[PDB]
Design a protein around this ligand. Structure first.
Ligand SMILES: Nc1nc2c(ncn2[C@@H]2O[C@@H]3COP(=O)(O)O[C@H]4[C@@H](O)[C@H](n5cnc6c(=O)[nH]c(N)nc65)O[C@@H]4COP(=O)(O)O[C@H]3[C@H]2O)c(=O)[nH]1
Ligand SMILES: Nc1nc2c(ncn2[C@@H]2O[C@@H]3COP(=O)(O)O[C@H]4[C@@H](O)[C@H](n5cnc6c(=O)[nH]c(N)nc65)O[C@@H]4COP(=O)(O)O[C@H]3[C@H]2O)c(=O)[nH]1
Length: 235
């Protein structure tokens, strides 16, 4: 839409990686960046991180007991996109954490559909979105992340009746601290339940509202582009 495409996170609708070397280098970078990994089986997902990686296996550490028999599904929350694969269990021993070892996958799939990178607002930044629903009821949301094309809003107290898919939040106001305020339409793309971590070992539940910007004027888009560049370069 704008042409601006910073390096990192090139789009792919689905790229298959199969080289044992690259698969290892990828696991090593995501263990280091402490990337979130998500583990799915029998209709639910654990969520952990990697503990070590070598040339035949990767290792996690979870209080839950993971099954055995066949390969189970994984999803890495990588800055390159969602990295998915299947891996089988090979070792487990008995903080009462069960050490776990999985064979490295033979192939990974990378999917990166985001045309604009998303900046995650850290506790150094306190941005909000306020507005009025169609019935005049007021709302105020924390902004979790923001990109040239939209944002994710966090709240414990959504009014779900105004948050169906593609519902419009008309004349929301982004409150971006030193950057001022911008009035904007938001199209609701998704609503999920999320567990970020509060301070500090305590994990807490939030609703996450994924939104697309519908700009009022072309200059509002350019203004957001300048804010994101500032955010990225100053952190
Ligand atoms: N309709 C819609 N929903 C959105 C969008 N962005 C986030 N969500 C919802 O928010 C969930 C969490 O997103 P995430 O924390 O960034 O965590 C994501 C993210 O880390 C990653 N991921 C998935 N797809 C992509 C992608 O196309 N690009 C990138 N860079 N990462 C992706 O895998 C994790 C899980 O993905 P999901 O299972 O799909 O789960 C997503 C998804 O349900 C969006 O642009 N449109
Ligand atoms: N900062 C931020 N912006 C958001 C969020 N959700 C939506 N947007 C903005 O709204 C645009 C369109 O969302 P979409 O229709 O669901 O269309 C999305 C969606 O279908 C898909 N996608 C991207 N990431 C994910 C993901 O993590 N999970 C899933 N299930 N789909 C994703 O790729 C399409 C386009 O991605 P985008 O180019 O990034 O384009 C996004 C993005 O600019 C959000 O949680 N945070």
């Amino acid at each position: 839409s704008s042409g601006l495409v910073p390096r990192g996170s090139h789009m792919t609708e689905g790229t298959i990686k199969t080289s044992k070397y690259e698969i290892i280098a990828i696991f090593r970078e995501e263990l280091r960046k402490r990337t979130e990994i998500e583990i799915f089986f029998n209709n639910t997902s654990i969520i952990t991180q990697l503990t070590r990686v070598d040339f035949a296996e990767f290792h996690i550490q979870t209080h839950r007991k993971i099954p055995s028999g066949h390969k189970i599904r994984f999803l890495l929350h990588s800055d390159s996109g969602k990295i998915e694969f299947n891996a089988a269990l090979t070792k487990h021993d008995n903080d009462k954490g069960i050490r776990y070892a999985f064979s490295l996958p033979e192939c990974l799939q990378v999917v990166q559909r985001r045309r604009d990178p998303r900046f995650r607002l850290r506790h150094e930044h306190d941005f909000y979105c306020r507005g009025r629903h169609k019935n005049g009821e007021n709302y105020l949301f924390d902004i979790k992340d923001i990109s040239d094309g939209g944002c994710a809003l966090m709240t414990k107290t959504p009014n779900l009746k105004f948050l169906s898919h593609n519902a419009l939040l008309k004349n929301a106001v982004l409150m971006l601290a030193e950057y001022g305020e911008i009035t904007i339409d938001l199209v609701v793309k998704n609503v999920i339940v999320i567990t970020l971590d509060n301070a500090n070992e305590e994990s807490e539940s939030y609703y996450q509202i994924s939104c697309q910007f519908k700009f009022r004027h072309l200059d509002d888009q350019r203004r957001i582009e300048k804010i994101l560049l500032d955010l990225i370069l100053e952190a």
